[PDB]
Design a protein around this nucleic acid. Sequence first.
DNA 1: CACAGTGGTAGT
DNA 2: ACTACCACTGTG
DNA 3: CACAGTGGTAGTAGG
DNA 4: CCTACTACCACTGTG
DNA 5: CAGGATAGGGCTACCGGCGGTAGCCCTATCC
DNA 6: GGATAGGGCTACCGCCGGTAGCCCTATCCTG
Lengths: 550, 549, 343, 343
Amino acid sequence: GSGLQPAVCLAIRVNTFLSCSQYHKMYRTVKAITGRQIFQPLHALRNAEKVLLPGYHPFEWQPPLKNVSSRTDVGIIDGLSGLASSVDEYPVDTIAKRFRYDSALVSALMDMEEDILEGMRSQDLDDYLNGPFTVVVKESCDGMGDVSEKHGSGPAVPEKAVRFSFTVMRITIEHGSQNVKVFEEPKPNSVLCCKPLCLMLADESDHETLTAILSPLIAEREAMKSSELTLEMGGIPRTFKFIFRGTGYDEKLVREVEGLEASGSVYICTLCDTTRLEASQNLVFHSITRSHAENLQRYEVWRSNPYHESVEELRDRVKGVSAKPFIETVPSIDALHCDIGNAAEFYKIFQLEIGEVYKHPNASKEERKRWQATLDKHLRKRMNLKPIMMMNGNFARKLMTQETVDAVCELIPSEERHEALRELMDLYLKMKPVWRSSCPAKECPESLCQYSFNSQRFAELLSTKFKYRYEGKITNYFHKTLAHVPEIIERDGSIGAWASEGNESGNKLFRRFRKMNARQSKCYEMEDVLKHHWLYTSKYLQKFMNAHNA
Amino acid sequence: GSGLQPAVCLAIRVNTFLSCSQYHKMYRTVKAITGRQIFQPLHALRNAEKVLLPGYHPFEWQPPLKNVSSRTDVGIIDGLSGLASSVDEYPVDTIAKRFRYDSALVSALMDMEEDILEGMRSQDLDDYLNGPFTVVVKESCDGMGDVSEKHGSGPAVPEKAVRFSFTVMRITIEHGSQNVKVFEEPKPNSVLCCKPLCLMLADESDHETLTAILSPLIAEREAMKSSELTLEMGGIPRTFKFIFRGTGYDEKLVREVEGLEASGSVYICTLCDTTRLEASQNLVFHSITRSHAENLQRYEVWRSNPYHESVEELRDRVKGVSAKPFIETVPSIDALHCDIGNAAEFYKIFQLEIGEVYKHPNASKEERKRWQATLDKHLRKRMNLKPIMMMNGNFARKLMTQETVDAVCELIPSEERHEALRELMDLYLKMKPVWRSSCPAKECPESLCQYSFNSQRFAELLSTKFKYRYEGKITNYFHKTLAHVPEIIERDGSIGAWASEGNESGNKLFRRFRKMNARQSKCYEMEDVLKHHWLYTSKYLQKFMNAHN
Amino acid sequence: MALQMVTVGHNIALIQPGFSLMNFDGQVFFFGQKGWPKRSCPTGVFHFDIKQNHLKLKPAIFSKDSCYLPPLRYPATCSYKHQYIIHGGKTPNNELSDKIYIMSVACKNNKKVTFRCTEKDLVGDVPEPRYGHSIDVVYSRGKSMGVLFGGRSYMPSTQRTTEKWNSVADCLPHVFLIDFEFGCATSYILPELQDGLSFHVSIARNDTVYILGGHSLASNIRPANLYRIRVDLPLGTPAVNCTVLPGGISVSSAILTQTNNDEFVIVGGYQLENQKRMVCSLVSLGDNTIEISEMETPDWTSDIKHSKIWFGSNMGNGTIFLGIPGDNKQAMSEAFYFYTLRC
Amino acid sequence: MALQMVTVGHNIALIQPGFSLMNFDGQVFFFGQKGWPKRSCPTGVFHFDIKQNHLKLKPAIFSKDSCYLPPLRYPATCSYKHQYIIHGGKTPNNELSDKIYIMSVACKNNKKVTFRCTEKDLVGDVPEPRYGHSIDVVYSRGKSMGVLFGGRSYMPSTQRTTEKWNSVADCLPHVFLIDFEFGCATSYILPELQDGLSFHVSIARNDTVYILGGHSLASNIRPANLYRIRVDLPLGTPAVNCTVLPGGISVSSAILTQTNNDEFVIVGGYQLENQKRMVCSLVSLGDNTIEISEMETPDWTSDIKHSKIWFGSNMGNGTIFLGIPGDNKQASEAFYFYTLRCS
DNA sequence: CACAGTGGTAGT
DNA sequence: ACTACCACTGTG
DNA sequence: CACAGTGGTAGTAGG
DNA sequence: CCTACTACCACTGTG
DNA sequence: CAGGATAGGGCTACCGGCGGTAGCCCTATCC
DNA sequence: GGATAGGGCTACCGCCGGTAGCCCTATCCTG
Ligand SMILES: [Zn+2]
Ligand SMILES: [Zn+2]
């Protein structure tokens, strides 16, 4: 007898990307070839995962859950959250699927209970501790698009998908005024840790389906922010608490949700109440003030203009907000789109230098396009970077390097620009692993210590050597990169382990599962995917693939 | 004993789309738990792969293959085939890793040999017979897009691929009075029978690189036609004899390779060389007189111009062939693209009937794009069908449904047009099981023998009720359906099989591999994609998968 | 008696289903957007003009004392004696406003508009945040006095959970007779009104309102029911009485235009959840009664008869707006097909 | 001695490398279009309308008594007398053509063109199916004779193989001699031409055609060199003599160009596979003399220097049309072209 | 250090 | 029989 | 009238 | 009463 | 006259949407 | 009227940028 444990499988399926029917093919085949039921039949995997999913491990809340039902078998809530479908009401063309926040947590913890226990053991702490923890979870609300429109049983969803995703970065406890963190995530931005919460086929361009569907999330989330869980792991009721550093949102979606002015505005930062021109002259000596509750009182005043101002000077009083922030989000950024925006700005910069626009800020448009074309051709020649439409992270990280800036400097007809691009690129390189690293405390501490003068010389190279392209027109992420990284890393530990990089990679899995690992039926796709992209991102299964060698 | 055999876990790798990096994940977890030796490790089933991929099973030809190498140690070859990608020559920016049609074909044979002999003993017929296995084969070249490699190693390939993918479909033996069907493939359009051969990275539109890569394969083929692959499998020489009935070429590429003018011309047919108007009028009686030998001779006269005529006189005298035919196709069609085009035309017809264009013959492009988004909205709510940038097959067969006609007629006060569309779609759905089927005479012979009068009444209708369209015009495919269909059936023996319904059903796996189950490489991503896709397409593996019973 | 395919240059997908028009000072005005006030029009409101079938939404700047109310979908809107009262509505974040919004005007010179918009403090017993309803006004002693009634609403916080966070409890039908501009609120639950509805079309005629149509999700039905909510304010207290009318019509989410004084052509709605109301319904608000004569229907387009959704509001001059969606070729390319109804 | 950015509105995806550029009476004619005769041009020739430095491409027609030819890329072309010769070409079916194509201009009537692209029969030691090379007639004693310095091609079928079906091996080193009042040709295994070169830029003369540069794949080398060819062409032709010479500059596949004199300019082919020949060297020939005057490389801009490839030929008079790859968002521009006016 | 892959040899 | 590069990925 | 999935549930074979 | 084998559902990529 | 409007470049964000090649054929403009 | 652009068909199987929004910036009114 060599019949595996059924939960030993379900980790050779949702970690080798197999599909249920394909695994049953494998099963039938190996079985009738060797006779032995080595693997476990499909229904075995189903009956097993039924426990890994949310709503199987009961719990309780010392402060009660406000505006929530105490039920604890909430498998997959229709992301609509009982939203009306009467055409009389708004037409909601979003076949949604939501794990109940405060029921997905418990599932990851009872699945990470293995790891919390192993850590508190290897930390010499009593493995039978009933102590009040404090979990730090990273929400990563992505706004993916261009997924599909499956021939639907009625509904006609936009060919896009938001993807809310809680990633449990750390699990903590104040052990005698000492906070021996129990779970230092090994790979915060991992394809295997961004646990999918809600998969609406709405679009981040929207604020109505998105909010009609995520206000439940945020309600139970503002409750959990003020309530303590208690999960029965290894028999012990570990009484967790949460803090929800959910700050992986991209700038488009964080502007939408927090109801800021917009992404491209005279108002530049979702963290500081500073404009674009101010942020294109100083760039370094900023602060961090745009807290979410600040934005709420700000929208109160905007909606009341208590001093009774007009549009523009009100917008200068609120300093950024027009809508109502419906989420909670501590002021922070998305290292992923930060690198992406800085790299796109740098591609533009290379267009400029190719076009000598450091001198000729009135050159034509088709010449900008021909600079872009020759530059695409060059980076396909030298660095082997075939032309992409907008940008991406493999290409940005292939680009933001001393090799690309050199193979491009050779094109610039000025050695001044040669050295200017060299300094810019190498300084941004010195300061990128600051937030691109999952932590600076061990991968680039000198980078942080020098970060004051580092971003200072960055800004002062942008000023003089780049009077063009930065006379006001400074990006959002240059402001962030330059005069917010230290504030953040101080107030928030790190950054790279709080951006939605793992989430924008889990979008790949969303595609792969909505294609291979789900019932191709509009009403069901999100159910099966959410479930499967969860099992994928369930440690109870990865341990069966990593504890082997490790 | 003691666990599996390598090829078996190979089947359980490829015929379930396990990446041989993820295969190792499963294996190492197994070791962590099972301990026993199952899932023969990567190098074991790799030296197994090398058995199934070509250039392992040796072979020979009694007429020696001309212009070919006498070697059976050559699988994945550079399609460029000595076409130096230097500056002096043409800049062939093509990641071309191709098998060799000889070696790959015999690899498929010995791959299916257990099925071959399984059938051979069937028919209450012998198993000793070594007579000429006069096999019948197809050759399906699909040109695709959105196949984007985005950081190569210098080769500036197009964002468009094309995978010449052959397929063996039947094998027969001159057993006295008849030629039995040894292995009559049940699903000749099934991807697990779509034998990939040459996965060029080039446009379906490109015609130099494309031919730079498929001149070697067609040289191989035209030399194979003459020869007989006298191999020895089952410890016995099973003398093979060949015929390469390439049909799976999509009609665009069909007109291309044979050299014809692209679709949209006034000469719309790869068959019978008929005009567009002679098609709109006759519409049922067109005889096959347009082959590749005739086409080569026809381009040869379109150049030689021995009677010294002008352009249009020659296009009429050559009956369309401008370029030189490349592939020795056998004149036929692709039920797949036939359905795609016929359903696109029916969709145009439906929106029009919503525009009552039979009454109002002409209209503005805005009113076309209007009272047509209503067709979309209605096939959205009432039927479960969506707008698609380009037509497809699921959408077609979910549109080629009298229910679809009810859906479109739900918004047309004109009852005569209701009955028009009803008869139209019922007659088309009595036609389609005659070509869209793998074998109609064995499947829907009554519709098949009625097909002549079916096409007759259909043409009569096209005249009567749908003349706002089809007034001196018709689609390439409405002609290939309302004629050449019975002729193709009787000459070839079927359509739904020889059609390209599978090659395009294999492009899905091509992309699935390039993205998932083969190296995200610079120039040898095609090497391992071809490997992987052959492995999926290995009978020697599929047999392990139908093993359940 | 006319219809036409109004067209849209910019900001097409901003006209969202469930919004509010405002036929104000003879100038029509969109209100209630898709996302949120977009700083191209941070106002919240839009200047609805139309000529030669190309809709113009000229962002209507607010004013100094103008509290920027948010974009409210399915709110309560009563063109008061050159003013408005905008209550409830589902904010673009999907929460409901507990606040009436007096959308007065400040200046109009040079075909411009300013929209003095003042939140008004609801006092004492006040109505809860709801939507889908329609407040209206009455003049008992010649005195603007409100009637807010019906209206879907998310369940009460204590009873409302997150699984059903988006449940809509048709609120207790409790006619809210707000006495504003010196107070705000005075509510009264009615004995003849037990099952709560919303999407109910109400009329602000003198000394009485005449409810019509709606949807009581409590029954998931479109009750054919009418109600004469009369008001009679003695010198010290208010008063109200309800008397159903025999002959009400069964529709929900209908649209109320006039086409002339003391006469309303309630155009369409959603007769049955799947069978949109493809008919109009003229009414004549007599001195003590009403007669809902079904005016001849403007035979719809080939699409409104074969879609599933549409909406609109009163553009004043007997005209009505509509939108029927279009499928995803693209999803936002067209996003709608709008339609004006001069009737 | 400078250039311009010729652009193509439509038919831009027709200029494939190796395309000839015929020069009939100043009027210039594209040849060697991409795919094959497309009914926009059912011949292949394209009336090459350069106007205001913009380029457009009218179609072009052939006589009734002409042989519609395939668009040949890297053919052996010439220009002598209005009457061309075109051998090889690598038909877009990637087949080499033993067929020789004598393109004339039949009737330039009504501001258009029409040609007589007659084939020819080659008795004697026929020249193999070739390409890359350049045929050129020798105006010696008024007797028509044509030199064909064997370029690169494929082996005879007695040696070819599918594994490298497109293995192009520089043809046997010769100077094939072909008549044009017969069409029958001869050739001689020269004791002096013992290098199988292709893609030379053979500059023409009365008899002293000088074989500048090339790229002999025989060892993947760019022999900067020359060669003399002395066609002794009495009515009974004896064996030619050769006299190798120095001065040859390193060009793989460059562009010849006359200037209505014996002062030909040779603009860039390739000094190296990945380092192209950014230099435009010249020549100035006589009876039995030749030199090279390195001209100032026209100071172009950032793009063409960093293109890694170009391709083109003589616009015919003294100027060169050539283009560089310009793949930006083609998935847009298919090329970026450039004409060079000399003097 | 995104990152968990992708065959494939390399090596060991 | 195991990992280690190794150029590259597709999510972004 | 392709085909090979697509997973949950259903429905029913061997104890 | 339980486990394991199919039978579905509309729909999916590839077209 | 001068704000005011309306719309396009271009500033971000950015994670794409109304259409497009590649032919072809039958319309339509200028001396 | 004999050349030369545009808009529909016909077969393909999306590709040049898709924008979503927010400045300025370039034109466009009341003669
Ligand atoms: Zn800031
Ligand atoms: Zn035909």
